[PDB]
């Protein structure tokens with residue numbers, strides 16, 4: 003099965019209203035920049051962002067010019083002529099709209115609250131999709147909380163029902179309408195809905211893990227924002243998942259959620275695989291096409307794992323644009339975020355940066371010795387290890403944020419497509435390194451084991467192993483006289 | 499309120515069928531031994547044991563001679579003339595009848611399954627109580643498993659209704675018919691039903707904690723079988739309660755069930771008090787009137803905390819009676835258990851035993867240097883700390899197993915009555931020692947705490963404390979934008 007390659011296309015309302023394909027000063031990345039070659043390297047384009055209005059329906063930003071917006075979407079759907087597998091999705095949400103303190107957060111909470119509101123919202127999604135020519139629905143709520151999860155899920159089920167009907171009605175069996183979400187890529191936000199991952203994923207074609215922004219100005223110590231594996235010299239974090247409303251025992255929580263742990267991409271993938279009902283083929287690994295910049299770092303380790311003096315406020319509170327060489331940061335008035343395209347021209351422009359590599363996290367980073375700057379980002383070389391990981395773990399594919407941040411040649415997108423599909427690329431000997439792996443074990447990734455069948459009437463000692471009702475169980479203490487699952491003495495440790 | 503003093507009277511079927519008050523070789527402890535003075539020192543006598551037959555009704559052992567059994571009961575109920583507060587209870591169950599592999603275990607499991615079976619069993623309990631002149635019903639099932647608890651509880655509720663009605667019908671408002679159980683006194687067996695303690699205790703007058711047999715031949719290391727507080731030099735155990743179906747988070751389970759922990763009487767009491775809905779006044783501390791003997795111990799600490807060569811099979815598999823001086827062990831064909839009366843005479847006979855004292859556990863023990871023997875037991879001085887504990891923790895009183903194991907002067911029973919009621923006994927200065935206390939915290943023992951009210955729209959750092967909806971909550975990590983109780987980030991740490 004061909005791996006998914008899901009690239010976000012984000013364009014602000016202002017850029018839609020003044021859309022042009024001939025002037026980077028108003029629209030830096032028009033649809034024209036997506037050539038036929040790039041469209042063939044993509045499987046999905048997530049147009050972003052749409053929102054949920056106060057009428058609890060999916061809708062565009064009220065300031066959007068509908069005619070210009072329809073034209074941009076048409077420019078995107080025209081790309082399907084170059085790739086009959088391409089889907090133009092649209093995304094509802096994003097951090098700005100849907101975060102706890104975001105402008106529209108209440109609309110997300112209310113839209114999923116009742117059967118009537120969910121049916122009304124679900125219909126609005128399909129309607130938006132058919133009216134504008136999209137190929138599926140992507141929900142990016144960051145993030146539903148525990149009491150909202152069940153309503154959120156019933157909404158996803160309802161959208162799945164109407165999409166499947168719309169697929170049959172439209173004869174789209176060859177390219178069915180799809181439903182996806184962007185999921186959390188770190189344990190803290192994941193813990194909000196972690197216990198109900200199976201029911202969340204069941205109606206989805208993919209869950210796109212936002213396995214980036216694992217470091218940023220909101221953290222006291224600088225770090226890699228999308229490390230694949232852990233670095234023992236780097237910071238560790240409290241495993242919030244051991245506090246999720248799972249209803250598991252102490253042993254189960256401990257074996258599944260070691261704490262502290264390394265906040266890595268591999269961690270977020272394994273934590274999804276630990277739950278029953280979450281198939282690997284539905285997991286998509288997100289990767290960033292941008293870097294995160296810190297100032298005020300110390301020396302001695304290339305800027306890694308150092309305290310810093312980067313403002314953490316949103317938006318950027320000053321007009322001090324201290325990322326040398328990033329005049330795209332001047333345009334956006336924020337020196338903390340730089341696209342891969344900008345970072346490339348910073349490296350080749352003699353600005354004082356060194357490209358260093360951490361062979362444990364398998365990610366690059368830039369260090370500025372003179373002004374004390376640190377940048378964490380990804381490139382075509384980090385994508386080689388992540389692509390092999392995707393294949394080894396039988397994941398659904400890759401997602402990235404976002405297209406407009408690739409270089410003008412599109413090397414990041416091409417690298418991803420190459421690593422999955424190029425007949426002349428062979429990563430069988432690529433060294434995945436000795437960085438720390440996430441070693442938790444849960445109900446969904448229990449190892450295959452063999453054990454004698456349980457015998458009623460037997461008294462088992464501590465550590466005895468038996469097979470029962472499909473699993474291998476182990477006693478946590480001695481003198482066990484009841485059956486596995488009947489008694490808290492038995493721990494599930496193996497499968498089949 | 500007078501503290502309860504509940505003494506079990508156990509007499510096997512063969513002793514009932516051949517009952518005599520003139521021959522200790524046939525009946526070692528006839529009812530005659532309980533004088534009016536001793537009768538005034540008791541509040542309850544639990545006659546034991548009755549059983550549940552295959553008709554799912556309460557009944558005597560089929561081999562019992564009914565006329566002789568009535569004679570034994572009448573000798574107990576006649577004692578009520580010397581103490582107008584005394585109740586002669588009868589107990590259903592015990593280890594031999596009700597343990598998982600016991601002869602009648604299925605009858606207990608099946609009796610509580612349905613409304614019809616529970617009603618039939620409950621009525622049989624009242625019918626036995628009135629027919630033989632008992633004053634209440636005591637259930638000693640060792641122990642109901644997790645799936646049986648709800649049915650067990652509905653059975654206890656149903657007995658409560660018929661007892662309350664029977665009290666009205668008989669004009670016994672002055673001495674109402676009572677309902678009790680013996681509960682587990684150690685975490686392993688307690689974990690079977692721990693989560694449902696409140697609903698179990700709700701219909702009861704008392705739950706009698708079997709806070710003994712916390713050491714025995716089934717343990718590899720010798721230890722005190724009823725230590726009041728923990729000895730750091732002694733063995734520690736896996737805290738099974740952290741594996742019970744409580745639905746708590748990792749932090750809550752860890753806060754409530756530190757592990758490993760000292761298996762003590764204080765542990766079992768505090769673990770009951772940690773649960774909401776379990777009033778201290780209903781908790782009764784059991785104490786043993788017998789000792790447990792081990793052979794093959796090493797020296798250096800009086801036989802404490804040593805490996806041993808004691809058989810653990812039941813019954814005792816040989817005729818090797820290695821407990822010097824214990825003639826009663828020869829009669830009973832088991833050198834591992836000795837009544838306090840017998841242990842006293844062993845100390846009086848120059849058999850090689852020394853009485854030592856552990857001032858951490860507040861319990862005595864015997865050590866035999868010559869043959870390497872160790873005995874854990876209780877006496878009148880250990881009862882001084884346990885009686886003071888009962889008063890300090892506002893428990894309902896004391897229970898003991900069993901009357902027939904006291905000496906003929908009744909010093910153990912007289913000691914308990916003295917420490918609770920004698921005007922000339924003063925334990926106000928008794929030093930409870932520095933033994934380890936059980937420090938767990940749960941919902942029934944959350945401390946009162948004060949914190950500023952939670953503020954919607956605020957971002958909290960890690961460790962912040964707020965008051966909300968009746969509790970004080972603490973953040974387990976930073977950047978918290980959700981309400982307490984709404985999210986896995988908040989930990990209940992105090993009550994408002």
Ligand SMILES: C[C@H](NC(=O)c1cc2c(=O)[n+]3ccccc3[nH]c2[n+](Cc2ccccc2)c1N)c1ccccc1
Nearest residue numbers: 096097098215216218219220292314315316339403977
């Ligand atoms: C999609 C991706 N990421 C966000 O959209 C975003 C993610 C976080 C975040 O994980 N996060 C985690 C923990 C605490 C705060 C916080 N805040 C976030 N802010 C808001 C923000 C805050 C401070 C500084 C900059 C931005 C955000 N916009 C992105 C978007 C645009 C450009 C590049 C990348």
Ligand SMILES: C[C@H](NC(=O)c1cc2c(=O)[n+]3ccccc3[nH]c2[n+](Cc2ccccc2)c1N)c1ccccc1
Nearest residue numbers: 481593594711714715716788809810811812834835899
């Ligand atoms: C009421 C008290 N206690 C028992 O009646 C008893 C309690 C256990 C027990 O807690 N326990 C806990 C864990 C594992 C096994 C086990 N077994 C028990 N056996 C049976 C037994 C088995 C092996 C060796 C000796 C005795 C027992 N009779 C008693 C009764 C009469 C005379 C003295 C004391």
